[PDB]
């Protein structure tokens, strides 16, 4: 169940969020889905709220929408949606990768 595709994580608790500074190696796959979320507003909301005294402000609509869209993506695929194939979605032709 873990070696076929990418295991869609279902959070055991409430659907919270974090904003992490990820390296290239920490992301398992570049998914095909296109979620048009606005990075500027999410930065202007997260960086403002992440003051420990102002960490408890009511959520912004863009952040709530992004979290809900990610959770719905997790629910909407039984084992993970297809990734942007190096060859079949990025239009490459290396034989070794096909093998």
UniProtKB/Swiss-Prot annotation:
It is found in: Nucleus; Cytoplasm. It comes from the Eukaryota. Disulfide bonds: none annotated. Belongs to the helicase family. SKI2 subfamily. It is linked to Trichohepatoenteric syndrome 2: A syndrome characterized by intrauterine growth retardation, severe diarrhea in infancy requiring total parenteral nutrition, facial dysmorphism, immunodeficiency, and hair abnormalities, mostly trichorrhexis nodosa. Hepatic involvement contributes to the poor prognosis of affected patients. Helicase component of the SKI complex, a multiprotein complex that assists the RNA-degrading exosome during the mRNA decay and quality-control pathways. The SKI complex catalyzes mRNA extraction from 80S ribosomal complexes in the 3'-5' direction and channels mRNA to the cytosolic exosome for degradation. SKI-mediated extraction of mRNA from stalled ribosomes allow binding of the Pelota-HBS1L complex and subsequent ribosome disassembly by ABCE1 for ribosome recycling. In the nucleus, the SKI complex associates with transcriptionally active genes in a manner dependent on PAF1 complex (PAF1C). Component of the SKI complex which consists of SKIC2, SKIC3 and SKIC8. Interacts with HBS1L isoform 2. This is Superkiller complex protein 2. It comes from Homo sapiens.
